[PDB]
Structures are given as C-alpha cells and as structure tokens.
Amino acid sequence: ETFYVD
Amino acid sequence: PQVTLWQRPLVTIKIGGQLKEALLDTGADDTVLEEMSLPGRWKPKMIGGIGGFIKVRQYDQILIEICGHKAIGTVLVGPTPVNIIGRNLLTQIGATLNFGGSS
Amino acid sequence: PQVTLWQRPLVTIKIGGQLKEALLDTGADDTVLEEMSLPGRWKPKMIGGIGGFIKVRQYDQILIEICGHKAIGTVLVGPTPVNIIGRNLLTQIGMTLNF
C-alpha cells in the first residue's frame, strides 16, 4: 500500500 | 514525540466526536478519511493517487485532534483504503521530517 | 537535516547512475519510481493506493543515494504519478517523524 495523494 | 519508521506511523485522531486510527503521511498534500459521519455541507472534488482517482466529499474548517494536538482544516471523505493525515494538517501540529546528518 | 512540511518534501536521488527528484513519503511502505531504465532481473507485482492498483517491476538490492545517504533495498518501477521514497528506504537513512 502506497499512499501519497494530490 | 519523535517517531521512527520501522512500522506505519499510526496515530489516534478524534473528529466529529468519533475516534479513529490514521496514518501520518508526508506524501499527501491533503487529509483523506474513510467514509464516515461528518456534520455540515460539503463540495465534490476529485483527488488522485497511485492507482488513479477517487471522488470525495470536501469538508472545510473541520476540527481534528491528532494524537492530542488540535488543528482545524480541510478534511476529505471518500473511498481511500486508509485514513491519512496529510501536510495540510501535519504543519499545524508541527511535524518535521528529520534525517541523518553529518550536519 | 530537519525538514518542515509547508511544501512537498522532495529530495534528489541517484539510482542506476541516473539523477531524479523523489518525495519522502512516510505513508508508503514501499519505494516506487516512475518507469526508468534499471539493469537486471525483476518480478511482476501489484501494489495499491488511493485510486486502485498498478502493476510493477520489483527490483531487489538496488543501491540508491537519497540526499547524499546511501541505502540498498527493494525498488518498484511502474506507472506511479510521482517518484516515492517509502519506509523500506527511509529507515536506512535514519528518517524520523517529530511533532
């Protein structure tokens, strides 16, 4: 699970 | 408190009178929470991530207590796989990212 | 080096002889870079995030220099919107979250 956002 | 990263940096948060676990996420510009009961009006918005995009409800000026520190800001609510606390709130509780040195 | 979060925490990295910009990401378990040329064998793998999943190439024991600090670990390569440095490498450079 790979969590950055924009 | 200082937090190492050998494990996910999870914290307890209190928002909308409810208690939840959330990830301190330096990689997120915004704070995004799993669907939950918030009070008030909201606006639609779209946010992107590693697998594409999701539609979320945008709530403004929401009060959140993150590991005992209060902050007020925008909180997005939608189909995120995990509750994430993004930079918009991390700055308010003074999180800093430190590493290595030499100098 | 202490880093505040008013702006994205970007750092310069050097990997596979190439220089790139990458985001220090405490919310990512793994390190994921945009399609790039890496040498060697790999394994197909899927990872998820907000928006769903993407398929990636899993390269093991890759040397990366992050802001001047060396580390060796697994690096995923695929269709991510941004180069991300995850906890698997952050621990190696003594990365701490303070507040």
Side-chain angles (χ1 to χ4, degrees), chain B residues 55-89:
Chain B
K55 192 157 72 66
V56 299
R57 308 203 293 295
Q58 177 179 313
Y59 291 85
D60 296 345
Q61 321 283 48
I62 289 289
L63 169 69
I64 306 201
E65 278 202 82
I66 302 172
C67 188
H69 296 68
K70 291 164 185 160
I72 287 185
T74 306
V75 171
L76 310 177
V77 190
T80 169
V82 175
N83 292 317
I84 55 183
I85 304 303
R87 295 185 299 101
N88 76 301
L89 293 193

PDB file of all heavy atoms in Angstrom, chain B residues 55-89:
ATOM      1  N   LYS B  55     -13.498   9.990  -6.064  1.00  0.00           N
ATOM      2  CA  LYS B  55     -14.282  11.185  -5.802  1.00  0.00           C
ATOM      3  C   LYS B  55     -14.490  11.251  -4.298  1.00  0.00           C
ATOM      4  O   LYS B  55     -14.755  10.239  -3.663  1.00  0.00           O
ATOM      5  CB  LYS B  55     -15.635  11.123  -6.525  1.00  0.00           C
ATOM      6  CG  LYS B  55     -16.372  12.456  -6.529  1.00  0.00           C
ATOM      7  CD  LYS B  55     -17.374  12.540  -7.683  1.00  0.00           C
ATOM      8  CE  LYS B  55     -18.587  11.644  -7.447  1.00  0.00           C
ATOM      9  NZ  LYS B  55     -19.381  12.113  -6.281  1.00  0.00           N
ATOM     10  N   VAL B  56     -14.361  12.442  -3.733  1.00  0.00           N
ATOM     11  CA  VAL B  56     -14.520  12.586  -2.294  1.00  0.00           C
ATOM     12  C   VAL B  56     -15.370  13.784  -1.930  1.00  0.00           C
ATOM     13  O   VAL B  56     -15.595  14.676  -2.752  1.00  0.00           O
ATOM     14  CB  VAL B  56     -13.155  12.748  -1.606  1.00  0.00           C
ATOM     15  CG1 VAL B  56     -12.297  11.511  -1.863  1.00  0.00           C
ATOM     16  CG2 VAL B  56     -12.484  14.007  -2.103  1.00  0.00           C
ATOM     17  N   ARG B  57     -15.857  13.796  -0.691  1.00  0.00           N
ATOM     18  CA  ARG B  57     -16.657  14.911  -0.217  1.00  0.00           C
ATOM     19  C   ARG B  57     -15.674  15.824   0.498  1.00  0.00           C
ATOM     20  O   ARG B  57     -14.886  15.362   1.320  1.00  0.00           O
ATOM     21  CB  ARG B  57     -17.752  14.402   0.734  1.00  0.00           C
ATOM     22  CG  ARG B  57     -18.591  13.271   0.132  1.00  0.00           C
ATOM     23  CD  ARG B  57     -19.968  13.141   0.780  1.00  0.00           C
ATOM     24  NE  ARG B  57     -19.911  12.711   2.174  1.00  0.00           N
ATOM     25  CZ  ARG B  57     -19.473  11.522   2.579  1.00  0.00           C
ATOM     26  NH1 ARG B  57     -19.046  10.631   1.691  1.00  0.00           N
ATOM     27  NH2 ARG B  57     -19.469  11.220   3.874  1.00  0.00           N
ATOM     28  N   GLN B  58     -15.692  17.106   0.170  1.00  0.00           N
ATOM     29  CA  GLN B  58     -14.787  18.064   0.788  1.00  0.00           C
ATOM     30  C   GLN B  58     -15.422  18.885   1.906  1.00  0.00           C
ATOM     31  O   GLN B  58     -16.351  19.653   1.662  1.00  0.00           O
ATOM     32  CB  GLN B  58     -14.245  19.020  -0.258  1.00  0.00           C
ATOM     33  CG  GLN B  58     -13.344  20.099   0.307  1.00  0.00           C
ATOM     34  CD  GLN B  58     -12.800  21.036  -0.749  1.00  0.00           C
ATOM     35  OE1 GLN B  58     -12.310  20.601  -1.791  1.00  0.00           O
ATOM     36  NE2 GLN B  58     -12.867  22.330  -0.479  1.00  0.00           N
ATOM     37  N   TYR B  59     -14.911  18.733   3.125  1.00  0.00           N
ATOM     38  CA  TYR B  59     -15.415  19.489   4.277  1.00  0.00           C
ATOM     39  C   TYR B  59     -14.392  20.524   4.729  1.00  0.00           C
ATOM     40  O   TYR B  59     -13.215  20.220   4.918  1.00  0.00           O
ATOM     41  CB  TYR B  59     -15.716  18.566   5.459  1.00  0.00           C
ATOM     42  CG  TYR B  59     -16.886  17.633   5.280  1.00  0.00           C
ATOM     43  CD1 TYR B  59     -16.736  16.408   4.634  1.00  0.00           C
ATOM     44  CD2 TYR B  59     -18.155  17.970   5.775  1.00  0.00           C
ATOM     45  CE1 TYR B  59     -17.805  15.539   4.485  1.00  0.00           C
ATOM     46  CE2 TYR B  59     -19.226  17.107   5.628  1.00  0.00           C
ATOM     47  CZ  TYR B  59     -19.051  15.894   4.987  1.00  0.00           C
ATOM     48  OH  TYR B  59     -20.108  15.012   4.851  1.00  0.00           O
ATOM     49  N   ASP B  60     -14.833  21.756   4.927  1.00  0.00           N
ATOM     50  CA  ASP B  60     -13.906  22.798   5.350  1.00  0.00           C
ATOM     51  C   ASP B  60     -13.968  23.119   6.832  1.00  0.00           C
ATOM     52  O   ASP B  60     -14.993  22.905   7.487  1.00  0.00           O
ATOM     53  CB  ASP B  60     -14.178  24.088   4.578  1.00  0.00           C
ATOM     54  CG  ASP B  60     -13.925  23.939   3.092  1.00  0.00           C
ATOM     55  OD1 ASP B  60     -13.272  22.946   2.702  1.00  0.00           O
ATOM     56  OD2 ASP B  60     -14.373  24.817   2.319  1.00  0.00           O
ATOM     57  N   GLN B  61     -12.856  23.616   7.352  1.00  0.00           N
ATOM     58  CA  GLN B  61     -12.778  24.047   8.731  1.00  0.00           C
ATOM     59  C   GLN B  61     -13.258  23.006   9.725  1.00  0.00           C
ATOM     60  O   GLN B  61     -14.056  23.295  10.631  1.00  0.00           O
ATOM     61  CB  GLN B  61     -13.605  25.325   8.880  1.00  0.00           C
ATOM     62  CG  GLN B  61     -13.482  26.280   7.696  1.00  0.00           C
ATOM     63  CD  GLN B  61     -12.183  27.056   7.705  1.00  0.00           C
ATOM     64  OE1 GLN B  61     -11.100  26.485   7.878  1.00  0.00           O
ATOM     65  NE2 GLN B  61     -12.281  28.374   7.507  1.00  0.00           N
ATOM     66  N   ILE B  62     -12.779  21.787   9.553  1.00  0.00           N
ATOM     67  CA  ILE B  62     -13.127  20.693  10.446  1.00  0.00           C
ATOM     68  C   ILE B  62     -12.086  20.646  11.570  1.00  0.00           C
ATOM     69  O   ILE B  62     -10.892  20.773  11.313  1.00  0.00           O
ATOM     70  CB  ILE B  62     -13.093  19.361   9.693  1.00  0.00           C
ATOM     71  CG1 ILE B  62     -14.265  19.286   8.723  1.00  0.00           C
ATOM     72  CG2 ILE B  62     -13.128  18.192  10.673  1.00  0.00           C
ATOM     73  CD1 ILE B  62     -15.609  19.127   9.426  1.00  0.00           C
ATOM     74  N   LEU B  63     -12.540  20.470  12.810  1.00  0.00           N
ATOM     75  CA  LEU B  63     -11.609  20.386  13.921  1.00  0.00           C
ATOM     76  C   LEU B  63     -11.193  18.938  14.095  1.00  0.00           C
ATOM     77  O   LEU B  63     -12.048  18.046  14.143  1.00  0.00           O
ATOM     78  CB  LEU B  63     -12.262  20.876  15.229  1.00  0.00           C
ATOM     79  CG  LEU B  63     -11.469  20.588  16.516  1.00  0.00           C
ATOM     80  CD1 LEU B  63     -10.160  21.426  16.591  1.00  0.00           C
ATOM     81  CD2 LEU B  63     -12.362  20.853  17.731  1.00  0.00           C
ATOM     82  N   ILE B  64      -9.890  18.707  14.206  1.00  0.00           N
ATOM     83  CA  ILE B  64      -9.371  17.350  14.416  1.00  0.00           C
ATOM     84  C   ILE B  64      -8.303  17.364  15.488  1.00  0.00           C
ATOM     85  O   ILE B  64      -7.465  18.264  15.515  1.00  0.00           O
ATOM     86  CB  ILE B  64      -8.717  16.751  13.139  1.00  0.00           C
ATOM     87  CG1 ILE B  64      -9.678  16.818  11.963  1.00  0.00           C
ATOM     88  CG2 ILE B  64      -8.328  15.287  13.389  1.00  0.00           C
ATOM     89  CD1 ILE B  64      -9.351  15.833  10.833  1.00  0.00           C
ATOM     90  N   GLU B  65      -8.349  16.405  16.409  1.00  0.00           N
ATOM     91  CA  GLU B  65      -7.312  16.331  17.429  1.00  0.00           C
ATOM     92  C   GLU B  65      -6.467  15.147  17.001  1.00  0.00           C
ATOM     93  O   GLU B  65      -6.962  14.015  16.941  1.00  0.00           O
ATOM     94  CB  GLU B  65      -7.871  16.085  18.827  1.00  0.00           C
ATOM     95  CG  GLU B  65      -8.370  17.327  19.498  1.00  0.00           C
ATOM     96  CD  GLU B  65      -8.415  17.184  21.013  1.00  0.00           C
ATOM     97  OE1 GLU B  65      -7.362  17.360  21.676  1.00  0.00           O
ATOM     98  OE2 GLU B  65      -9.509  16.878  21.527  1.00  0.00           O
ATOM     99  N   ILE B  66      -5.206  15.424  16.665  1.00  0.00           N
ATOM    100  CA  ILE B  66      -4.269  14.395  16.194  1.00  0.00           C
ATOM    101  C   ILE B  66      -3.279  14.098  17.310  1.00  0.00           C
ATOM    102  O   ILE B  66      -2.461  14.938  17.655  1.00  0.00           O
ATOM    103  CB  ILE B  66      -3.529  14.909  14.927  1.00  0.00           C
ATOM    104  CG1 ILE B  66      -4.560  15.263  13.848  1.00  0.00           C
ATOM    105  CG2 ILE B  66      -2.548  13.851  14.409  1.00  0.00           C
ATOM    106  CD1 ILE B  66      -3.978  15.952  12.634  1.00  0.00           C
ATOM    107  N   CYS B  67      -3.363  12.892  17.870  1.00  0.00           N
ATOM    108  CA  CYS B  67      -2.509  12.488  18.976  1.00  0.00           C
ATOM    109  C   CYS B  67      -2.433  13.612  20.020  1.00  0.00           C
ATOM    110  O   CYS B  67      -1.337  14.033  20.405  1.00  0.00           O
ATOM    111  CB  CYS B  67      -1.103  12.125  18.467  1.00  0.00           C
ATOM    112  SG  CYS B  67       0.027  11.374  19.701  1.00  0.00           S
ATOM    113  N   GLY B  68      -3.599  14.119  20.440  1.00  0.00           N
ATOM    114  CA  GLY B  68      -3.638  15.157  21.464  1.00  0.00           C
ATOM    115  C   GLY B  68      -3.299  16.584  21.067  1.00  0.00           C
ATOM    116  O   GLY B  68      -3.124  17.441  21.939  1.00  0.00           O
ATOM    117  N   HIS B  69      -3.172  16.853  19.772  1.00  0.00           N
ATOM    118  CA  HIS B  69      -2.875  18.206  19.306  1.00  0.00           C
ATOM    119  C   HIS B  69      -4.006  18.624  18.377  1.00  0.00           C
ATOM    120  O   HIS B  69      -4.387  17.901  17.446  1.00  0.00           O
ATOM    121  CB  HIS B  69      -1.528  18.247  18.582  1.00  0.00           C
ATOM    122  CG  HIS B  69      -0.364  17.923  19.466  1.00  0.00           C
ATOM    123  ND1 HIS B  69      -0.156  16.670  20.001  1.00  0.00           N
ATOM    124  CD2 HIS B  69       0.638  18.702  19.938  1.00  0.00           C
ATOM    125  CE1 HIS B  69       0.920  16.690  20.765  1.00  0.00           C
ATOM    126  NE2 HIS B  69       1.420  17.912  20.746  1.00  0.00           N
ATOM    127  N   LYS B  70      -4.565  19.794  18.634  1.00  0.00           N
ATOM    128  CA  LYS B  70      -5.679  20.276  17.843  1.00  0.00           C
ATOM    129  C   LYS B  70      -5.265  20.994  16.558  1.00  0.00           C
ATOM    130  O   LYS B  70      -4.225  21.644  16.499  1.00  0.00           O
ATOM    131  CB  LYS B  70      -6.551  21.195  18.714  1.00  0.00           C
ATOM    132  CG  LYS B  70      -7.287  20.435  19.817  1.00  0.00           C
ATOM    133  CD  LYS B  70      -7.814  21.369  20.891  1.00  0.00           C
ATOM    134  CE  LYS B  70      -8.439  20.573  22.039  1.00  0.00           C
ATOM    135  NZ  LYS B  70      -8.504  21.405  23.270  1.00  0.00           N
ATOM    136  N   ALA B  71      -6.098  20.865  15.537  1.00  0.00           N
ATOM    137  CA  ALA B  71      -5.870  21.513  14.259  1.00  0.00           C
ATOM    138  C   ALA B  71      -7.219  21.679  13.593  1.00  0.00           C
ATOM    139  O   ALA B  71      -8.147  20.903  13.859  1.00  0.00           O
ATOM    140  CB  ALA B  71      -4.939  20.654  13.385  1.00  0.00           C
ATOM    141  N   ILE B  72      -7.357  22.711  12.759  1.00  0.00           N
ATOM    142  CA  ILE B  72      -8.597  22.921  12.032  1.00  0.00           C
ATOM    143  C   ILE B  72      -8.203  23.062  10.582  1.00  0.00           C
ATOM    144  O   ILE B  72      -7.267  23.813  10.272  1.00  0.00           O
ATOM    145  CB  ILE B  72      -9.325  24.225  12.404  1.00  0.00           C
ATOM    146  CG1 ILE B  72      -9.962  24.120  13.785  1.00  0.00           C
ATOM    147  CG2 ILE B  72     -10.409  24.494  11.390  1.00  0.00           C
ATOM    148  CD1 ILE B  72     -10.796  25.337  14.138  1.00  0.00           C
ATOM    149  N   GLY B  73      -8.902  22.348   9.703  1.00  0.00           N
ATOM    150  CA  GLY B  73      -8.599  22.430   8.285  1.00  0.00           C
ATOM    151  C   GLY B  73      -9.528  21.605   7.430  1.00  0.00           C
ATOM    152  O   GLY B  73     -10.539  21.064   7.890  1.00  0.00           O
ATOM    153  N   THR B  74      -9.172  21.495   6.162  1.00  0.00           N
ATOM    154  CA  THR B  74      -9.972  20.743   5.223  1.00  0.00           C
ATOM    155  C   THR B  74      -9.776  19.256   5.366  1.00  0.00           C
ATOM    156  O   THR B  74      -8.652  18.771   5.449  1.00  0.00           O
ATOM    157  CB  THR B  74      -9.616  21.150   3.791  1.00  0.00           C
ATOM    158  OG1 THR B  74      -9.737  22.574   3.681  1.00  0.00           O
ATOM    159  CG2 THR B  74     -10.528  20.451   2.781  1.00  0.00           C
ATOM    160  N   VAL B  75     -10.877  18.527   5.380  1.00  0.00           N
ATOM    161  CA  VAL B  75     -10.821  17.097   5.502  1.00  0.00           C
ATOM    162  C   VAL B  75     -11.657  16.476   4.389  1.00  0.00           C
ATOM    163  O   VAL B  75     -12.831  16.779   4.253  1.00  0.00           O
ATOM    164  CB  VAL B  75     -11.370  16.657   6.882  1.00  0.00           C
ATOM    165  CG1 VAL B  75     -11.526  15.159   6.928  1.00  0.00           C
ATOM    166  CG2 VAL B  75     -10.437  17.141   7.982  1.00  0.00           C
ATOM    167  N   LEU B  76     -11.048  15.604   3.600  1.00  0.00           N
ATOM    168  CA  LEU B  76     -11.758  14.950   2.510  1.00  0.00           C
ATOM    169  C   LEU B  76     -12.268  13.586   2.981  1.00  0.00           C
ATOM    170  O   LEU B  76     -11.590  12.873   3.740  1.00  0.00           O
ATOM    171  CB  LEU B  76     -10.817  14.814   1.286  1.00  0.00           C
ATOM    172  CG  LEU B  76     -10.100  16.115   0.894  1.00  0.00           C
ATOM    173  CD1 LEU B  76      -9.119  15.888  -0.293  1.00  0.00           C
ATOM    174  CD2 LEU B  76     -11.149  17.147   0.493  1.00  0.00           C
ATOM    175  N   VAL B  77     -13.466  13.210   2.541  1.00  0.00           N
ATOM    176  CA  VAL B  77     -14.056  11.938   2.942  1.00  0.00           C
ATOM    177  C   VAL B  77     -14.401  11.132   1.696  1.00  0.00           C
ATOM    178  O   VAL B  77     -15.134  11.618   0.832  1.00  0.00           O
ATOM    179  CB  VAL B  77     -15.347  12.170   3.795  1.00  0.00           C
ATOM    180  CG1 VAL B  77     -15.823  10.865   4.423  1.00  0.00           C
ATOM    181  CG2 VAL B  77     -15.073  13.211   4.868  1.00  0.00           C
ATOM    182  N   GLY B  78     -13.852   9.930   1.597  1.00  0.00           N
ATOM    183  CA  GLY B  78     -14.102   9.099   0.441  1.00  0.00           C
ATOM    184  C   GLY B  78     -13.511   7.708   0.513  1.00  0.00           C
ATOM    185  O   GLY B  78     -12.912   7.320   1.521  1.00  0.00           O
ATOM    186  N   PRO B  79     -13.631   6.930  -0.577  1.00  0.00           N
ATOM    187  CA  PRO B  79     -13.128   5.566  -0.659  1.00  0.00           C
ATOM    188  C   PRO B  79     -11.612   5.313  -0.618  1.00  0.00           C
ATOM    189  O   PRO B  79     -11.079   4.521  -1.419  1.00  0.00           O
ATOM    190  CB  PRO B  79     -13.789   5.041  -1.942  1.00  0.00           C
ATOM    191  CG  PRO B  79     -13.846   6.224  -2.789  1.00  0.00           C
ATOM    192  CD  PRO B  79     -14.312   7.308  -1.830  1.00  0.00           C
ATOM    193  N   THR B  80     -10.916   5.958   0.317  1.00  0.00           N
ATOM    194  CA  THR B  80      -9.495   5.724   0.470  1.00  0.00           C
ATOM    195  C   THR B  80      -9.328   4.419   1.240  1.00  0.00           C
ATOM    196  O   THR B  80     -10.112   4.105   2.116  1.00  0.00           O
ATOM    197  CB  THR B  80      -8.797   6.842   1.278  1.00  0.00           C
ATOM    198  OG1 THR B  80      -7.460   6.426   1.617  1.00  0.00           O
ATOM    199  CG2 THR B  80      -9.572   7.144   2.571  1.00  0.00           C
ATOM    200  N   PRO B  81      -8.305   3.636   0.911  1.00  0.00           N
ATOM    201  CA  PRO B  81      -8.093   2.369   1.631  1.00  0.00           C
ATOM    202  C   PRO B  81      -7.679   2.584   3.103  1.00  0.00           C
ATOM    203  O   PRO B  81      -7.870   1.704   3.952  1.00  0.00           O
ATOM    204  CB  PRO B  81      -6.996   1.686   0.806  1.00  0.00           C
ATOM    205  CG  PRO B  81      -6.305   2.854   0.150  1.00  0.00           C
ATOM    206  CD  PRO B  81      -7.387   3.765  -0.231  1.00  0.00           C
ATOM    207  N   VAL B  82      -7.133   3.759   3.420  1.00  0.00           N
ATOM    208  CA  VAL B  82      -6.678   4.045   4.791  1.00  0.00           C
ATOM    209  C   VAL B  82      -6.845   5.520   5.151  1.00  0.00           C
ATOM    210  O   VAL B  82      -6.741   6.380   4.279  1.00  0.00           O
ATOM    211  CB  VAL B  82      -5.169   3.674   4.943  1.00  0.00           C
ATOM    212  CG1 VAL B  82      -4.652   4.075   6.325  1.00  0.00           C
ATOM    213  CG2 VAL B  82      -4.973   2.178   4.706  1.00  0.00           C
ATOM    214  N   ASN B  83      -7.114   5.818   6.426  1.00  0.00           N
ATOM    215  CA  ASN B  83      -7.250   7.197   6.873  1.00  0.00           C
ATOM    216  C   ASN B  83      -5.876   7.842   6.803  1.00  0.00           C
ATOM    217  O   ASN B  83      -4.936   7.323   7.400  1.00  0.00           O
ATOM    218  CB  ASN B  83      -7.703   7.268   8.329  1.00  0.00           C
ATOM    219  CG  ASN B  83      -9.123   6.783   8.522  1.00  0.00           C
ATOM    220  OD1 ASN B  83     -10.009   7.107   7.732  1.00  0.00           O
ATOM    221  ND2 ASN B  83      -9.351   6.021   9.590  1.00  0.00           N
ATOM    222  N   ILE B  84      -5.737   8.950   6.084  1.00  0.00           N
ATOM    223  CA  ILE B  84      -4.430   9.579   6.002  1.00  0.00           C
ATOM    224  C   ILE B  84      -4.463  11.037   6.440  1.00  0.00           C
ATOM    225  O   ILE B  84      -5.397  11.786   6.125  1.00  0.00           O
ATOM    226  CB  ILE B  84      -3.843   9.517   4.576  1.00  0.00           C
ATOM    227  CG1 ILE B  84      -4.820  10.117   3.590  1.00  0.00           C
ATOM    228  CG2 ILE B  84      -3.507   8.071   4.167  1.00  0.00           C
ATOM    229  CD1 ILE B  84      -4.313  10.019   2.197  1.00  0.00           C
ATOM    230  N   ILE B  85      -3.454  11.426   7.210  1.00  0.00           N
ATOM    231  CA  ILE B  85      -3.348  12.810   7.653  1.00  0.00           C
ATOM    232  C   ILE B  85      -2.260  13.400   6.773  1.00  0.00           C
ATOM    233  O   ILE B  85      -1.103  12.974   6.846  1.00  0.00           O
ATOM    234  CB  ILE B  85      -2.890  12.911   9.108  1.00  0.00           C
ATOM    235  CG1 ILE B  85      -3.848  12.113  10.013  1.00  0.00           C
ATOM    236  CG2 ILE B  85      -2.817  14.402   9.509  1.00  0.00           C
ATOM    237  CD1 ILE B  85      -5.292  12.558   9.899  1.00  0.00           C
ATOM    238  N   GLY B  86      -2.642  14.370   5.951  1.00  0.00           N
ATOM    239  CA  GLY B  86      -1.724  14.992   5.016  1.00  0.00           C
ATOM    240  C   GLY B  86      -1.062  16.278   5.499  1.00  0.00           C
ATOM    241  O   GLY B  86      -1.330  16.746   6.591  1.00  0.00           O
ATOM    242  N   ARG B  87      -0.224  16.883   4.646  1.00  0.00           N
ATOM    243  CA  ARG B  87       0.517  18.058   5.062  1.00  0.00           C
ATOM    244  C   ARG B  87      -0.328  19.234   5.520  1.00  0.00           C
ATOM    245  O   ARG B  87       0.110  19.994   6.386  1.00  0.00           O
ATOM    246  CB  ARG B  87       1.508  18.506   3.959  1.00  0.00           C
ATOM    247  CG  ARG B  87       2.649  17.481   3.682  1.00  0.00           C
ATOM    248  CD  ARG B  87       3.689  18.040   2.662  1.00  0.00           C
ATOM    249  NE  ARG B  87       3.098  18.341   1.346  1.00  0.00           N
ATOM    250  CZ  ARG B  87       2.764  19.563   0.940  1.00  0.00           C
ATOM    251  NH1 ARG B  87       2.980  20.605   1.730  1.00  0.00           N
ATOM    252  NH2 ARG B  87       2.165  19.736  -0.229  1.00  0.00           N
ATOM    253  N   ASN B  88      -1.513  19.385   4.956  1.00  0.00           N
ATOM    254  CA  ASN B  88      -2.378  20.496   5.354  1.00  0.00           C
ATOM    255  C   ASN B  88      -2.624  20.487   6.861  1.00  0.00           C
ATOM    256  O   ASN B  88      -2.796  21.561   7.480  1.00  0.00           O
ATOM    257  CB  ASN B  88      -3.692  20.465   4.549  1.00  0.00           C
ATOM    258  CG  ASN B  88      -4.669  19.399   5.031  1.00  0.00           C
ATOM    259  OD1 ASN B  88      -4.363  18.201   5.042  1.00  0.00           O
ATOM    260  ND2 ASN B  88      -5.862  19.833   5.412  1.00  0.00           N
ATOM    261  N   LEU B  89      -2.611  19.298   7.487  1.00  0.00           N
ATOM    262  CA  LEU B  89      -2.775  19.226   8.944  1.00  0.00           C
ATOM    263  C   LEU B  89      -1.457  18.981   9.674  1.00  0.00           C
ATOM    264  O   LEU B  89      -1.266  19.451  10.810  1.00  0.00           O
ATOM    265  CB  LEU B  89      -3.817  18.162   9.364  1.00  0.00           C
ATOM    266  CG  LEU B  89      -5.272  18.476   8.953  1.00  0.00           C
ATOM    267  CD1 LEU B  89      -6.222  17.520   9.702  1.00  0.00           C
ATOM    268  CD2 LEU B  89      -5.638  19.908   9.275  1.00  0.00           C
TER     269      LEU B  89
END
